[PDB]
Short mmCIF file of C-alpha atoms in Angstrom, two decimals:
data_model
loop_
_atom_site.label_atom_id
_atom_site.label_comp_id
_atom_site.label_asym_id
_atom_site.label_seq_id
_atom_site.Cartn_x
_atom_site.Cartn_y
_atom_site.Cartn_z
CA UNK A 1 -8.46 7.61 -43.08
CA UNK A 2 -6.07 9.52 -40.80
CA UNK A 3 -7.00 8.26 -37.32
CA UNK A 4 -6.18 4.54 -37.44
CA UNK A 5 -3.58 4.31 -40.19
CA UNK A 6 -0.66 2.08 -39.12
CA UNK A 7 2.69 3.70 -38.76
CA UNK A 8 4.79 0.55 -38.85
CA UNK A 9 5.23 -2.81 -39.98
CA UNK A 10 8.59 -3.16 -38.18
CA UNK A 11 10.68 -5.99 -36.77
CA UNK A 12 10.42 -6.52 -33.01
CA UNK A 13 13.01 -8.73 -31.30
CA UNK A 14 12.04 -10.83 -28.29
CA UNK A 15 14.37 -11.75 -25.42
CA UNK A 16 16.23 -14.06 -27.81
CA UNK A 17 15.42 -11.75 -30.73
CA UNK A 18 12.59 -13.46 -32.62
CA UNK A 19 10.42 -11.43 -34.98
CA UNK A 20 7.08 -10.97 -33.21
CA UNK A 21 3.63 -9.75 -34.27
CA UNK A 22 3.41 -6.24 -35.71
CA UNK A 23 -0.31 -6.33 -35.21
CA UNK A 24 -0.25 -8.10 -38.57
CA UNK A 25 -0.72 -11.70 -37.40
CA UNK A 26 -4.37 -12.67 -37.91
CA UNK A 27 -5.00 -15.07 -35.05
CA UNK A 28 -7.98 -17.40 -34.93
CA UNK A 29 -10.45 -15.77 -32.53
CA UNK A 30 -13.71 -17.00 -31.04
CA UNK A 31 -14.38 -14.38 -28.33
CA UNK A 32 -15.95 -11.41 -30.10
CA UNK A 33 -16.45 -7.96 -28.61
CA UNK A 34 -18.88 -5.07 -28.99
CA UNK A 35 -19.05 -1.51 -27.70
CA UNK A 36 -21.93 0.81 -26.90
CA UNK A 37 -23.42 3.51 -24.72
CA UNK A 38 -25.55 3.07 -21.60
CA UNK A 39 -28.72 2.44 -23.62
CA UNK A 40 -27.51 -0.85 -25.06
CA UNK A 41 -26.12 -1.73 -21.63
CA UNK A 42 -29.55 -1.36 -20.05
CA UNK A 43 -31.14 -3.27 -22.91
CA UNK A 44 -28.69 -6.10 -22.27
CA UNK A 45 -29.36 -6.07 -18.53
CA UNK A 46 -33.13 -6.28 -18.86
CA UNK A 47 -32.68 -8.97 -21.50
CA UNK A 48 -30.60 -11.12 -19.19
CA UNK A 49 -33.17 -10.63 -16.45
CA UNK A 50 -35.97 -11.95 -18.66
CA UNK A 51 -33.77 -14.82 -19.84
CA UNK A 52 -32.84 -15.90 -16.31
CA UNK A 53 -36.46 -15.91 -15.16
CA UNK A 54 -37.68 -18.03 -18.06
CA UNK A 55 -34.71 -20.32 -17.47
CA UNK A 56 -35.81 -20.91 -13.89
CA UNK A 57 -39.29 -21.73 -15.18
CA UNK A 58 -37.85 -24.26 -17.60
CA UNK A 59 -35.80 -25.80 -14.81
CA UNK A 60 -38.97 -26.27 -12.74
CA UNK A 61 -40.96 -27.75 -15.66
CA UNK A 62 -40.23 -31.32 -14.55
CA UNK B 1 -22.81 3.13 -38.10
CA UNK B 2 -21.52 1.42 -34.95
CA UNK B 3 -23.62 -1.60 -35.87
CA UNK B 4 -22.17 -1.42 -39.39
CA UNK B 5 -18.70 -1.58 -37.87
CA UNK B 6 -19.66 -4.47 -35.60
CA UNK B 7 -21.07 -6.43 -38.54
CA UNK B 8 -17.80 -5.74 -40.34
CA UNK B 9 -15.75 -7.14 -37.46
CA UNK B 10 -18.11 -9.97 -36.58
CA UNK B 11 -18.31 -12.32 -39.57
CA UNK B 12 -14.52 -12.08 -39.70
CA UNK B 13 -13.77 -15.09 -37.50
CA UNK B 14 -10.14 -13.89 -37.51
CA UNK B 15 -8.88 -10.35 -37.03
CA UNK B 16 -5.51 -8.96 -35.97
CA UNK B 17 -5.16 -6.64 -32.97
CA UNK B 18 -4.77 -3.69 -35.34
CA UNK B 19 -8.13 -4.08 -37.09
CA UNK B 20 -10.00 -4.38 -33.79
CA UNK B 21 -8.18 -1.28 -32.58
CA UNK B 22 -9.22 0.64 -35.69
CA UNK B 23 -12.76 -0.59 -35.08
CA UNK B 24 -12.54 0.75 -31.53
CA UNK B 25 -11.22 4.17 -32.56
CA UNK B 26 -13.73 4.41 -35.42
CA UNK B 27 -16.55 3.70 -32.99
CA UNK B 28 -15.27 6.17 -30.40
CA UNK B 29 -14.90 8.88 -33.05
CA UNK B 30 -18.44 8.17 -34.23
CA UNK B 31 -19.52 8.55 -30.60
CA UNK B 32 -17.59 11.40 -28.99
CA UNK B 33 -15.74 12.01 -25.73
CA UNK B 34 -18.47 12.59 -23.14
CA UNK B 35 -20.49 9.39 -23.63
CA UNK B 36 -19.40 6.63 -21.27
CA UNK B 37 -18.34 3.52 -23.16
CA UNK B 38 -19.22 -0.03 -22.17
CA UNK B 39 -18.18 -3.25 -23.85
CA UNK B 40 -19.80 -6.68 -24.11
CA UNK B 41 -17.80 -9.77 -25.00
CA UNK B 42 -19.52 -12.86 -26.36
CA UNK B 43 -17.62 -16.14 -26.01
CA UNK B 44 -19.52 -18.58 -28.19
CA UNK B 45 -16.98 -21.28 -27.27
CA UNK B 46 -17.96 -21.23 -23.60
CA UNK B 47 -21.15 -19.30 -24.43
CA UNK B 48 -20.58 -16.56 -21.86
CA UNK B 49 -21.22 -12.83 -22.11
CA UNK B 50 -19.31 -10.30 -20.06
CA UNK B 51 -20.09 -6.63 -19.48
CA UNK B 52 -17.18 -4.28 -18.78
CA UNK B 53 -17.24 -0.50 -18.45
CA UNK B 54 -14.42 0.68 -20.72
CA UNK B 55 -12.95 4.00 -19.63
CA UNK B 56 -10.17 6.16 -21.00
CA UNK B 57 -7.60 3.93 -19.25
CA UNK B 58 -9.07 0.51 -20.14
CA UNK B 59 -7.21 -1.63 -22.67
CA UNK B 60 -8.92 -3.30 -25.62
CA UNK B 61 -8.06 -6.99 -25.13
CA UNK B 62 -7.56 -8.15 -21.57
CA UNK B 63 -7.48 -11.95 -21.84
CA UNK B 64 -3.80 -12.23 -22.83
CA UNK B 65 -1.94 -14.88 -20.86
CA UNK B 66 1.81 -14.92 -21.68
CA UNK B 67 4.33 -12.13 -21.14
CA UNK B 68 5.65 -12.53 -24.69
CA UNK B 69 2.08 -12.98 -25.89
CA UNK B 70 1.54 -9.86 -23.82
CA UNK B 71 4.49 -8.41 -25.77
CA UNK B 72 2.75 -9.02 -29.09
CA UNK B 73 -0.88 -8.36 -28.21
CA UNK B 74 -0.68 -5.22 -26.15
CA UNK B 75 2.24 -4.09 -28.19
CA UNK B 76 -0.26 -4.00 -31.01
CA UNK B 77 -2.65 -1.52 -29.41
CA UNK B 78 -0.37 1.48 -29.59
CA UNK B 79 -0.47 1.60 -33.41
CA UNK B 80 -3.45 3.91 -33.83
CA UNK B 81 -2.56 7.37 -35.05
CA UNK B 82 -4.65 8.46 -32.08
CA UNK B 83 -2.83 8.72 -28.72
CA UNK B 84 -2.31 5.82 -26.33
CA UNK B 85 -4.71 3.51 -24.57
CA UNK B 86 -4.41 3.05 -20.81
CA UNK B 87 -2.19 6.12 -20.35
CA UNK B 88 -3.54 9.64 -19.92
CA UNK B 89 -1.69 12.49 -21.75
CA UNK C 1 1.49 -5.57 -16.35
CA UNK C 2 4.29 -3.08 -17.04
CA UNK C 3 5.20 -5.07 -20.15
CA UNK C 4 1.93 -3.96 -21.77
CA UNK C 5 2.85 -0.28 -21.38
CA UNK C 6 6.45 -0.80 -22.49
CA UNK C 7 5.53 -2.82 -25.58
CA UNK C 8 2.80 -0.37 -26.61
CA UNK C 9 5.29 2.47 -26.17
CA UNK C 10 7.96 0.72 -28.24
CA UNK C 11 5.36 0.03 -30.92
CA UNK C 12 4.29 3.64 -31.31
CA UNK C 13 7.95 4.54 -31.41
CA UNK C 14 8.12 2.22 -34.44
CA UNK C 15 4.90 3.88 -35.60
CA UNK C 16 6.36 7.38 -35.61
CA UNK C 17 9.23 5.75 -37.49
CA UNK C 18 7.66 4.67 -40.72
CA UNK C 19 5.08 7.43 -40.61
CA UNK C 20 8.09 9.71 -40.95
CA UNK C 21 9.69 7.29 -43.41
CA UNK C 22 6.56 7.14 -45.54
CA UNK C 23 6.18 10.87 -46.23
CA UNK C 24 9.89 11.74 -46.38
CA UNK C 25 9.99 12.35 -50.18
CA UNK C 26 7.55 15.23 -49.63
CA UNK C 27 9.42 16.82 -46.70
CA UNK C 28 13.19 16.82 -47.21
CA UNK C 29 15.63 17.57 -50.00
CA UNK C 30 18.22 15.22 -48.47
CA UNK C 31 18.19 12.28 -46.07
CA UNK C 32 21.16 10.07 -45.18
CA UNK C 33 20.54 7.52 -42.44
CA UNK C 34 23.61 5.78 -41.03
CA UNK C 35 23.65 2.81 -38.66
CA UNK C 36 27.05 3.27 -37.08
CA UNK C 37 28.54 0.55 -34.93
CA UNK C 38 28.33 2.33 -31.61
CA UNK C 39 26.50 5.06 -29.68
CA UNK C 40 27.97 8.42 -30.65
CA UNK C 41 28.13 10.69 -27.61
CA UNK C 42 28.88 13.82 -29.67
CA UNK C 43 29.43 15.30 -33.14
CA UNK C 44 31.15 18.41 -34.44
CA UNK C 45 31.30 19.55 -38.05
CA UNK C 46 34.67 20.24 -39.65
CA UNK C 47 35.16 23.58 -41.46
CA UNK C 48 37.51 22.17 -44.12
CA UNK C 49 35.87 20.87 -47.27
CA UNK C 50 36.67 19.01 -50.47
CA UNK C 51 34.83 19.91 -53.68
CA UNK C 52 34.89 17.25 -56.42
CA UNK C 53 33.20 19.27 -59.14
CA UNK C 54 33.91 16.97 -62.09
CA UNK C 55 32.90 13.93 -60.02
CA UNK C 56 30.15 16.19 -58.69
CA UNK C 57 29.91 16.45 -54.92
CA UNK C 58 31.56 17.80 -51.80
CA UNK C 59 32.94 15.92 -48.81
CA UNK C 60 32.81 17.36 -45.32
CA UNK C 61 34.37 15.84 -42.22
CA UNK C 62 32.95 14.85 -38.85
CA UNK C 63 34.48 14.07 -35.47
CA UNK C 64 32.67 11.49 -33.33
CA UNK C 65 33.35 10.08 -29.92
CA UNK C 66 31.55 6.77 -29.41
CA UNK C 67 31.44 3.97 -26.88
CA UNK C 68 32.04 0.47 -28.17
CA UNK C 69 31.07 -0.85 -24.71
CA UNK C 70 31.67 -0.02 -21.07
CA UNK C 71 35.25 1.16 -20.77
CA UNK C 72 35.76 0.81 -24.54
CA UNK C 73 35.59 4.51 -25.35
CA UNK C 74 36.80 5.66 -28.74
CA UNK C 75 36.99 8.49 -31.27
CA UNK C 76 36.54 8.52 -35.04
CA UNK C 77 36.52 10.75 -38.12
CA UNK C 78 33.89 10.51 -40.87
CA UNK C 79 33.69 11.81 -44.44
CA UNK C 80 30.26 12.91 -45.66
CA UNK C 81 29.02 13.27 -49.25
CA UNK C 82 26.85 16.27 -50.09
CA UNK C 83 25.47 16.71 -53.62
CA UNK C 84 26.49 19.56 -55.90
CA UNK C 85 24.53 22.58 -57.15
CA UNK C 86 26.97 24.43 -59.42
CA UNK C 87 27.29 22.76 -62.81
CA UNK C 88 26.94 9.14 -51.85
CA UNK C 89 28.02 7.49 -48.62
CA UNK C 90 29.05 8.12 -45.01
CA UNK C 91 32.61 6.85 -44.55
CA UNK C 92 33.90 6.02 -41.06
CA UNK C 93 37.66 5.90 -40.42
CA UNK C 94 40.43 7.20 -38.14
CA UNK C 95 39.34 5.26 -35.04
CA UNK C 96 41.52 5.79 -31.94
CA UNK C 97 40.77 4.40 -28.49
CA UNK C 98 40.42 7.03 -25.69
CA UNK C 99 41.75 6.48 -22.15
CA UNK C 100 38.40 7.28 -20.50
CA UNK C 101 34.92 8.57 -21.18
CA UNK C 102 33.84 11.33 -23.54
CA UNK C 103 30.82 13.44 -22.74
CA UNK C 104 32.04 16.51 -24.63
CA UNK C 105 34.84 16.67 -27.20
CA UNK C 106 35.42 20.18 -28.55
CA UNK C 107 37.95 21.02 -31.24
CA UNK C 108 39.72 24.37 -31.33
CA UNK C 109 38.12 26.63 -33.98
CA UNK C 110 41.26 27.88 -35.72
CA UNK C 111 43.10 24.54 -35.41
CA UNK C 112 41.38 21.20 -35.99
CA UNK C 113 44.25 19.10 -34.61
CA UNK C 114 43.44 19.87 -30.97
CA UNK C 115 40.44 18.39 -29.15
CA UNK C 116 39.61 18.92 -25.49
CA UNK C 117 37.80 15.82 -24.26
CA UNK C 118 36.01 15.23 -20.97
CA UNK C 119 33.55 12.57 -19.88
CA UNK C 120 31.08 11.72 -17.15
CA UNK C 121 33.66 9.34 -15.65
CA UNK C 122 36.63 11.59 -14.83
CA UNK C 123 37.39 15.10 -13.56
CA UNK C 124 40.47 15.54 -15.79
CA UNK C 125 40.36 17.41 -19.09
CA UNK C 126 42.48 15.71 -21.75
CA UNK C 127 43.53 17.87 -24.72
CA UNK C 128 44.85 16.08 -27.82
CA UNK C 129 46.97 17.49 -30.68
CA UNK C 130 48.57 16.51 -34.00
CA UNK C 131 51.19 14.17 -32.60
CA UNK C 132 48.84 12.36 -30.22
CA UNK C 133 46.57 11.25 -33.07
CA UNK C 134 49.42 10.69 -35.54
CA UNK C 135 51.76 8.98 -33.07
CA UNK C 136 48.97 6.52 -32.28
CA UNK C 137 49.01 3.31 -34.33
CA UNK C 138 45.89 1.15 -34.42
CA UNK C 139 48.15 -1.92 -34.11
CA UNK C 140 49.37 -0.73 -30.70
CA UNK C 141 47.80 -2.09 -27.54
CA UNK C 142 47.60 1.27 -25.72
CA UNK C 143 45.27 4.24 -26.33
CA UNK C 144 46.42 7.77 -27.11
CA UNK C 145 47.80 10.24 -24.63
CA UNK C 146 46.57 13.83 -25.04
CA UNK C 147 48.68 16.92 -25.49
CA UNK C 148 47.96 18.02 -21.90
CA UNK C 149 46.13 16.96 -18.72
CA UNK C 150 44.20 19.87 -17.16
CA UNK C 151 42.95 19.22 -13.60
CA UNK C 152 41.49 21.72 -11.14
CA UNK C 153 38.05 20.22 -10.59
CA UNK C 154 37.12 17.46 -8.17
CA UNK C 155 33.97 16.30 -10.04
CA UNK C 156 33.77 15.36 -13.74
CA UNK C 157 33.39 18.25 -16.15
CA UNK C 158 30.20 18.64 -18.17
CA UNK C 159 31.38 20.69 -21.16
CA UNK C 160 34.12 22.91 -22.57
CA UNK C 161 34.42 25.80 -25.03
CA UNK C 162 37.36 27.36 -26.83
CA UNK C 163 37.71 31.07 -27.44
CA UNK C 164 36.90 31.80 -31.08
CA UNK C 165 39.37 34.73 -31.11
CA UNK C 166 41.64 34.40 -28.05
CA UNK C 167 44.23 31.94 -29.28
CA UNK C 168 44.23 28.80 -27.18
CA UNK C 169 41.80 29.90 -24.46
CA UNK C 170 39.38 27.32 -23.08
CA UNK C 171 36.72 26.97 -20.40
CA UNK C 172 35.56 23.98 -18.37
CA UNK C 173 32.46 23.85 -16.19
CA UNK C 174 32.06 20.80 -14.02
CA UNK C 175 29.79 18.82 -11.74
CA UNK C 176 31.19 20.38 -8.53
CA UNK C 177 29.56 23.70 -9.57
CA UNK C 178 32.85 25.44 -10.44
CA UNK C 179 34.29 27.03 -13.58
CA UNK C 180 37.83 27.17 -14.98
CA UNK C 181 39.29 29.30 -17.78
CA UNK C 182 42.49 27.80 -19.21
CA UNK C 183 45.45 29.08 -21.27
CA UNK C 184 47.73 26.51 -22.93
CA UNK C 185 50.40 28.93 -24.19
CA UNK C 186 51.13 29.60 -20.51
CA UNK C 187 52.34 26.07 -19.79
CA UNK C 188 55.29 25.09 -17.66
CA UNK C 189 56.65 21.55 -17.53
CA UNK C 190 57.08 22.21 -13.81
CA UNK C 191 53.64 23.89 -13.57
CA UNK C 192 50.75 22.00 -15.14
CA UNK C 193 48.66 24.42 -13.05
CA UNK C 194 50.03 27.47 -14.91
CA UNK C 195 47.47 26.68 -17.60
CA UNK C 196 44.90 27.69 -14.94
CA UNK C 197 43.94 31.22 -15.90
CA UNK C 198 40.90 31.51 -13.62
CA UNK C 199 38.71 29.29 -11.47
CA UNK C 200 35.27 30.57 -10.48
CA UNK C 201 32.75 29.55 -7.83
CA UNK C 202 29.58 31.45 -8.73
CA UNK C 203 27.19 28.53 -9.16
CA UNK C 204 25.20 26.77 -6.47
CA UNK C 205 24.07 23.50 -8.12
CA UNK C 206 25.78 21.23 -10.65
CA UNK C 207 26.64 23.19 -13.79
CA UNK C 208 25.20 21.94 -17.07
CA UNK C 209 26.79 24.39 -19.53
CA UNK C 210 29.50 27.06 -19.69
CA UNK C 211 30.21 28.74 -22.99
CA UNK C 212 31.89 31.82 -24.45
CA UNK C 213 30.74 34.69 -26.63
CA UNK C 214 31.09 34.18 -30.37
CA UNK C 215 32.70 37.55 -31.04
CA UNK C 216 34.20 38.51 -27.66
CA UNK C 217 37.09 37.19 -25.57
CA UNK C 218 35.89 38.32 -22.15
CA UNK C 219 32.19 37.36 -22.15
CA UNK C 220 30.84 33.94 -21.20
CA UNK C 221 27.64 32.48 -19.79
CA UNK C 222 27.06 29.67 -17.32
CA UNK C 223 23.80 27.91 -16.55
CA UNK C 224 23.13 25.62 -13.62
CA UNK C 225 20.55 23.21 -12.17
CA UNK C 226 19.50 25.84 -9.61
CA UNK C 227 17.42 27.47 -12.39
CA UNK C 228 19.95 30.28 -12.74
CA UNK C 229 21.86 32.01 -15.50
CA UNK C 230 25.18 33.59 -14.56
CA UNK C 231 27.09 36.03 -16.77
CA UNK C 232 30.87 35.98 -16.34
CA UNK C 233 33.61 38.26 -17.58
CA UNK C 234 37.03 36.77 -16.89
CA UNK C 235 38.98 40.07 -16.73
CA UNK C 236 36.89 41.05 -13.70
CA UNK C 237 39.06 40.63 -10.59
CA UNK C 238 36.17 39.51 -8.37
CA UNK C 239 35.10 37.01 -11.06
CA UNK C 240 36.58 34.12 -9.04
CA UNK C 241 33.57 34.42 -6.68
CA UNK C 242 31.38 37.20 -8.16
CA UNK C 243 29.70 36.69 -11.56
CA UNK C 244 28.97 39.65 -13.80
CA UNK C 245 25.23 38.94 -13.54
CA UNK C 246 22.83 36.40 -12.03
CA UNK C 247 19.27 35.97 -13.30
CA UNK C 248 16.40 33.59 -12.53
CA UNK C 249 15.86 32.38 -16.08
CA UNK C 250 13.68 29.28 -15.58
CA UNK C 251 11.92 27.22 -12.92
CA UNK C 252 13.71 23.95 -13.68
CA UNK C 253 17.31 22.71 -13.99
CA UNK C 254 18.85 24.46 -16.99
CA UNK C 255 20.53 22.17 -19.52
CA UNK C 256 22.18 24.33 -22.18
CA UNK C 257 22.65 27.85 -23.54
CA UNK C 258 23.42 28.90 -27.11
CA UNK C 259 24.98 32.17 -28.27
CA UNK C 260 23.78 33.86 -31.44
CA UNK C 261 26.78 33.71 -33.81
CA UNK C 262 25.76 36.67 -35.98
CA UNK C 263 24.25 38.93 -33.31
CA UNK C 264 26.20 39.49 -30.10
CA UNK C 265 23.05 40.27 -28.08
CA UNK C 266 20.81 37.18 -28.19
CA UNK C 267 21.26 33.98 -26.24
CA UNK C 268 18.93 31.01 -25.91
CA UNK C 269 18.40 28.83 -22.86
CA UNK C 270 16.77 25.41 -22.52
CA UNK C 271 15.51 23.66 -19.38
CA UNK C 272 13.53 20.63 -18.31
CA UNK C 273 10.61 23.08 -18.05
CA UNK C 274 9.86 22.25 -21.72
CA UNK C 275 10.22 25.98 -22.56
CA UNK C 276 12.93 27.82 -24.49
CA UNK C 277 13.89 31.26 -23.21
CA UNK C 278 15.53 34.09 -25.13
CA UNK C 279 17.78 36.72 -23.58
CA UNK C 280 19.13 40.14 -24.56
CA UNK C 281 22.02 41.62 -22.58
CA UNK C 282 20.75 45.23 -22.38
CA UNK C 283 17.43 44.07 -20.89
CA UNK C 284 18.18 41.19 -18.50
CA UNK C 285 15.33 41.89 -16.06
CA UNK C 286 12.92 40.35 -18.55
CA UNK C 287 12.67 37.08 -20.45
CA UNK C 288 12.92 38.10 -24.08
CA UNK C 289 10.43 35.46 -25.25
CA UNK C 290 9.38 31.87 -24.66
CA UNK C 291 8.90 29.23 -27.37
CA UNK C 292 6.47 26.41 -26.62
CA UNK C 293 5.85 23.09 -28.31
CA UNK C 294 7.81 20.38 -26.52
CA UNK C 295 5.70 18.48 -24.02
CA UNK C 296 8.50 16.99 -21.94
CA UNK C 297 12.17 17.82 -21.14
CA UNK C 298 14.06 19.77 -23.77
CA UNK C 299 17.77 19.00 -23.59
CA UNK C 300 19.85 21.07 -26.00
CA UNK C 301 19.66 23.94 -28.49
CA UNK C 302 21.71 25.64 -31.21
CA UNK C 303 21.56 28.58 -33.61
CA UNK C 304 22.06 28.52 -37.36
CA UNK C 305 25.55 29.74 -38.36
CA UNK C 306 24.12 31.12 -41.63
CA UNK C 307 20.94 32.98 -40.59
CA UNK C 308 20.36 34.10 -37.01
CA UNK C 309 16.50 33.93 -36.91
CA UNK C 310 16.68 30.11 -37.18
CA UNK C 311 16.96 28.24 -33.87
CA UNK C 312 17.01 24.47 -33.42
CA UNK C 313 15.97 22.62 -30.27
CA UNK C 314 16.09 18.94 -29.32
CA UNK C 315 14.06 17.26 -26.62
CA UNK C 316 13.19 13.95 -25.02
CA UNK C 317 9.95 13.45 -26.99
CA UNK C 318 12.07 12.36 -29.98
CA UNK C 319 11.52 15.59 -31.95
CA UNK C 320 13.77 18.43 -33.06
CA UNK C 321 12.01 21.72 -33.72
CA UNK C 322 13.28 24.55 -35.93
CA UNK C 323 11.93 28.03 -35.20
CA UNK C 324 12.01 31.06 -37.48
CA UNK C 325 11.83 33.92 -34.98
CA UNK C 326 10.87 36.46 -37.65
CA UNK C 327 7.25 35.47 -36.93
CA UNK C 328 6.73 37.04 -33.50
CA UNK C 329 3.34 38.69 -33.21
CA UNK C 330 2.12 37.50 -36.61
CA UNK C 331 -1.41 36.40 -37.50
CA UNK C 332 -2.31 32.76 -38.07
CA UNK C 333 -5.55 31.20 -39.31
CA UNK C 334 -7.63 28.95 -37.09
CA UNK C 335 -6.34 25.67 -38.55
CA UNK C 336 -2.82 27.11 -38.56
CA UNK C 337 -2.84 27.20 -34.74
CA UNK C 338 -2.92 23.41 -34.45
CA UNK C 339 0.77 22.76 -35.04
CA UNK C 340 1.75 25.46 -32.54
CA UNK C 341 2.58 29.17 -32.48
CA UNK C 342 3.32 30.66 -35.92
CA UNK C 343 7.00 31.25 -35.09
CA UNK C 344 7.45 27.46 -35.20
CA UNK C 345 8.90 26.53 -38.60
CA UNK C 346 9.73 22.82 -38.89
CA UNK C 347 9.63 19.59 -36.89
CA UNK C 348 11.71 16.48 -37.53
CA UNK C 349 11.03 13.13 -35.87
CA UNK C 350 12.71 10.44 -37.97
CA UNK C 351 14.48 9.05 -34.90
CA UNK C 352 13.29 6.33 -32.52
CA UNK C 353 14.71 7.40 -29.14
CA UNK C 354 16.19 10.36 -27.33
CA UNK C 355 18.32 12.27 -29.80
CA UNK C 356 21.75 12.66 -28.24
CA UNK C 357 22.91 15.80 -30.05
CA UNK C 358 22.89 17.87 -33.23
CA UNK C 359 25.23 20.06 -35.26
CA UNK C 360 24.81 22.27 -38.32
CA UNK C 361 27.02 21.57 -41.30
CA UNK C 362 28.51 25.07 -41.75
CA UNK C 363 29.36 24.44 -45.41
CA UNK C 364 25.78 23.76 -46.56
CA UNK C 365 22.64 25.69 -45.70
CA UNK C 366 19.57 24.31 -43.90
CA UNK C 367 21.39 21.04 -43.23
CA UNK C 368 21.83 19.38 -39.85
CA UNK C 369 23.28 16.14 -38.50
CA UNK C 370 21.78 14.45 -35.44
CA UNK C 371 23.08 11.49 -33.43
CA UNK C 372 20.56 9.53 -31.36
CA UNK C 373 20.51 6.97 -28.56
CA UNK C 374 19.68 4.07 -30.92
CA UNK C 375 23.02 4.10 -32.76
CA UNK C 376 21.60 6.20 -35.61
CA UNK C 377 22.95 9.24 -37.45
CA UNK C 378 20.72 11.54 -39.50
CA UNK C 379 21.84 14.03 -42.14
CA UNK C 380 18.83 16.06 -43.19
CA UNK C 381 17.73 19.32 -44.80
CA UNK C 382 14.09 20.31 -45.42
CA UNK C 383 12.71 21.18 -48.82
CA UNK C 384 13.12 24.64 -50.29
CA UNK C 385 9.33 25.02 -50.44
CA UNK C 386 8.93 25.68 -46.71
CA UNK C 387 11.58 28.43 -46.63
CA UNK C 388 12.25 29.25 -50.30
#
């Protein structure tokens, strides 16, 4: 409640002076992000290993 | 709790810099200082994942492309009531 | 790449802004924010006062020197509304263009009409009087001309100080590390150098501040970038090269020194070493105390002309701190140690850049006016609750 509370909406002027984003413009995003410790990192690494191996198998299937 | 926060951010297909920054600081606070933080971005548009060790000098969003879009996006990060990202006190 | 840092920094400046703006009604008993035209290099409160009791306020006066632009260097007088206890605007006017720059403009204590002005752009001191302001006409194409031109230095002067008792006695410390005490009632039309009472070379680096005792003609202090305090008495004969004392006060370039108006024994000294030093004249071997709390360069300091234990300090981290020194050695709870040592009293950060300067309004208690680098003036007094 006291760590991430904004401390402005305020007008920012560009080189010409245009009002820019106060961190209040909700853009349309597609690239999501996640954070974690080393445990989830290692999980992800082993997971990609297994995925890549089965992908090679599927590519040989023909 | 970190997964709670990720679910909160995730379904929101739009989210301002601020809210992602509050998500970041919430997560870090739930974690602590001495656990090394890594990040994983999922780009379902080009379907690519990327693993990046985030330190105490790493900025939240790094794929900004224009110097005025720089202006807006990594202006936005220094809004947390916590101290700065990328600079060390 | 540097953009990112700059824009973040600007944004948290804005952040500090409305996070001060948001909780103001629980902190202060008065706030007047004024967006003047121009950057105000200095301010000095005026001791004369109007009291409109039936209307219900008081007006005080202010003297500003501002820059309109490069080379456009001007002066102005303001009237300031304070509310009334015993039973609301900031008005600019009296704008006269100056010949050159103003870094310090001091008015004589017992006579408002005179102002000694110097700037970072000239080594001449220009002292203005009644006629110079009143003979000027804003329709005229030329600026004013001061009462006198005082010139001994070869580098621009940093500040000046009148004698509060000695009638028409002034001092000027400059950038060429020299001092000059001046006496206007010893003029000669043939001798513009007869105003030169004394010139001193005691300092070794560029002087940042020279300033007299509040209750004494013959005592002044000088502080210089070589981390040294010098004590001068002008009626010494050897004072032209020998100071009365010389002390290693800090480890960085000293910016300013303030004399306790009530008590003739305490002075305060600020440096870029982010630490405020106290000094007592009977024990000069020893730093009296050190107040911490600014985490980059502190620039300038001042005592309260109503109570001595209150000291104000301004710094580059956009804060001004007020210390009540009656809390040396006291106890403080665990959570009370967060904000700093217990002798810290108040902290104001409504600005958005380096505060230029301050001044106490001597007609109202607990009130101060601050001019900052972003063309902003602040009149503010905290609530009673913190000190009442």
